[PDB]
Every structure is written in C-alpha cells, then in structure tokens.
C-alpha cells in the first residue's frame, strides 16, 4: 500500500467535493467520504437518508464502541447530530494499515449530504482544537500516525475535470514539477495561513495585508470556492470586472447567483484576469505566488440540459469569517499539508490548468522591506 497504489484514489463531483474509499467496522463496511482539510471530525451517516446510497450500521459491527456522548453541529450552511464511538478504520487505496479511531455517527442532518454527491461522510483533517464537541476527540490523522509508523504528513492532488490523489506518509515527486514552495502553518487548529499580497493581472489590490487575513486565512479542500473577507472581494470584483469590461455579466453572475453560458467550446478565457495570492514564506518577509487561471475560478456546472454551451458559476465569494482557499485554489497544485514541519508546501501539479497562453504557476522568492505582520 505504498505511493505509487495511492495514486488516483480520489473522486468527485464538481463544486461538490472529492472523496476517497475508506472501510469502518469488523466486517468492513465500504464508505465515499469527503477529504476535508477544513474541519477535524471522522463523521459517518448511520441512519437512512434520502441521499445516501449506504451508511454505517453499527450494530453490524462487532467491534463497535459506544463512547456514550452525542455530539450536535450546527455550522453555516447546515446541521448534524449523532453519537460518538471507535471501531477500525481502514483507507483500502491508501496506507496499507488499520487502525482504531473515533466516528461520529450520523443520526440526523439538514442540508449536510448533498443529492448524487456520491460521498457518506466526512474525513476532517485539521487539528484537534476544533474537533467537535471538544478538543479531547482525537482526530483521525492523529490515531492514524500515533498508532502506525506513518510520517506526519499527507498531500492532495487535486484535479478538475473530476478525481485526484491524497498521498498519505510522504511526498510522490511524480505528482509535481519545478519547485515545492512553503508557507508556515500559523497556528495548529485550521490550516492557517498568512497571505501578504494579492495581484489581479499583475496589479497589486494595495490593501494592507492584514485585510486579506481577516480573520484568518485557511486552506480547505472541503469549501469549493475563493471566499475572500468582504474589503478584499469587493476589490477583487472591480479588478475583474475591470479586466473583462469586453463583456458584461448580470449581477447575479458575480454574487455567485446565476450561471454565464457560451457555446460550447467558445469561452472567453483570455477576457479573464490571473489572480496571484503570494504567501508568507519560511523566511522573513519572503514570499511565494501561486496563481489561479480562469479555468479555476470559474467552475464549470455540468448539465445535460445546458449542455449546446458550456455554462460557469463565479466560485469566488464573499466572506465573514476570512479567506479560505478552497478546492478551485487547491485544483491543479500539488499541496503538501507537512505536519512534522507546520508548514505547507505548494507545486505545480501534474493535472495544472493551462492553455495555449497562460499556465497555473508557483513562483519565488519575492522580497519586501517594507512589511508589517500580515496577520490578525
Ligand atoms: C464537524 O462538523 C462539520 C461541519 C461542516 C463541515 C464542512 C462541510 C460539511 C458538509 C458538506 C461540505 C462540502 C460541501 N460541498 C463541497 N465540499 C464540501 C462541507 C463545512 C466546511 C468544511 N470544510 N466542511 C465539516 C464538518
């Protein structure tokens, strides 16, 4: 069960996440579930769902236990509720291991699965500290390495269409190109960040840079777009606008609302800015950009009956609690989540977004003298 099983086992759908086959229970019980770096819960439907094609039985499993404490979530977008317990985990097209680890069972939901996402749960990756109900529920990758001789680290590759890799233990040098380039994990709860510019066509937003961290910046595979603080995408907005002025959209296109369409094969991407975010680096006020072609920001909605054209969802949007960079940034760069190190590392991926005029990049150094910390 080494890298070079590992790789391509990931699925998805679009803007709707990707997942990886794991088992739970004694015997195994097959699940999809989403890899998320934005939370820290193993979280699994146990009861029927109208869109889950299976779930966790527990009773199935004989080697099940019961931790006797519910848990309850109630986040932006939705709810859920179940009942904590451990039972044996494996990851069939990842480490050849298994391991026991906590699972929360789903017992009820609203607005949690989504209708043919193909997923029944839930892998949450970050740390410990916003584990719920508390901190004490050790998350999955802790068990994992605590109970295996794993390294501290796993990455993702991403990919549009859609599928991927998440290469846990190490770094798989055929997955990238050139360079890894890394930014310091700020604290251990999220994958925080610290972002110290942004360009749009190469034109700085001129904000101070502790804008574009309000109040934290995350890197989350389980958020599908850009969500930027409102300052900062309010300016990224006009810059676009600005740079696409060829062709007007409705305003229902920029909030996220409402497709754009142009016959099949016709899209304009060259009408469309770059984005650079430039991130903290290892060393004092040196940096690193990764840059996002429209290829990524403007995700394709997949419909048999739209589809004369291909039709795009702006996958940018606003923010109240601070930028995240979701699975549209993630897409087409190898990202390395290097726990031992509290950093992580960002290369051009194998599946990078290009045409015939621009291409996906990671590129450094970059200096600045002039530098404040750029964090809240
Ligand atoms: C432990 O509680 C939660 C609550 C929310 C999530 C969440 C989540 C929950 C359900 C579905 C999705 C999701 C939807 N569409 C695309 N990708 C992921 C994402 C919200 C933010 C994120 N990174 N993960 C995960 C665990």
Redesign the pocket.
């Known amino acids: 069960g080494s890298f070079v099983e590992m790789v391509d086992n990931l699925r998805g759908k679009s803007?709707?996440?990707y997942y990886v086959e794991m088992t739970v229970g004694s015997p195994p019980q097959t699940l999809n579930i989403?890899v998320?770096?934005?939370?820290?819960?193993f979280?699994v439907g146990a009861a029927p769902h109208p869109f889950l094609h299976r779930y966790y039985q527990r009773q199935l499993s004989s080697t099940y236990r019961d931790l006797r404490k519910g848990v309850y979530?109630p986040?932006?977008?939705?709810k859920?509720e179940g009942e904590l317990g451990t039972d044996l985990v494996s990851i069939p097209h990842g480490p050849n291991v298994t391991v026991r680890a906590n699972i929360?069972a789903i017992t009820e939901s609203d607005k949690?699965?989504?209708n043919g996402?193909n997923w029944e749960g839930?892998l949450?990756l970050a740390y410990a500290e916003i584990?719920?109900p508390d901190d004490s529920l050790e998350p999955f990758f802790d068990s994992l390495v605590k109970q295996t001789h794993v390294p501290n680290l796993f990455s993702l590759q991403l990919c549009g269409a859609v599928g991927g890799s998440m290469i846990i233990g190490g770094i798989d040098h055929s997955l990238y190109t050139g360079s890894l380039w890394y930014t310091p994990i700020r604290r251990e709860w999220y994958y925080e960040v610290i972002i110290v510019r942004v360009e749009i066509n190469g034109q700085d937003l001129k904000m101070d840079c502790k804008e574009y961290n309000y109040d934290k910046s995350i890197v989350?595979?389980?958020?599908?777009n850009l969500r930027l603080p409102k300052k900062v995408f309010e300016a990224a907005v006009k810059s676009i606008k600005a740079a696409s002025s060829t062709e007007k959209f409705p305003d229902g296109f920029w909030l996220g609302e409402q497709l754009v369409c142009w016959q099949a094969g016709t899209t304009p991407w060259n009408i469309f800015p770059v984005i650079s975010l430039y991130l903290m680096g290892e060393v004092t006020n040196q940096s690193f950009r990764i840059t996002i072609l429209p290829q990524q920001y403007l995700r394709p909605v997949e419909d048999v009956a739209t589809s004369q054209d291909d039709c795009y969802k702006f996958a940018i949007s606003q923010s109240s609690t601070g930028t995240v960079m979701g699975?549209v940034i993630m897409e087409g760069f190898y990202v390395v989540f290097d726990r031992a190190r509290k950093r992580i590392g960002f290369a051009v991926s194998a599946c990078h977004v290009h045409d015939e005029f621009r291409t996906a990049a990671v590129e450094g150094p970059f200096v600045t003298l002039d530098m404040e910390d750029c964090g809240y």
């Open positions: 803007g709707q996440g989403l998320d770096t934005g939370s820290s819960n979280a979530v986040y932006t977008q939705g859920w929360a949690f699965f989504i996402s839930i949450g584990a719920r989350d595979s389980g958020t599908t699975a």
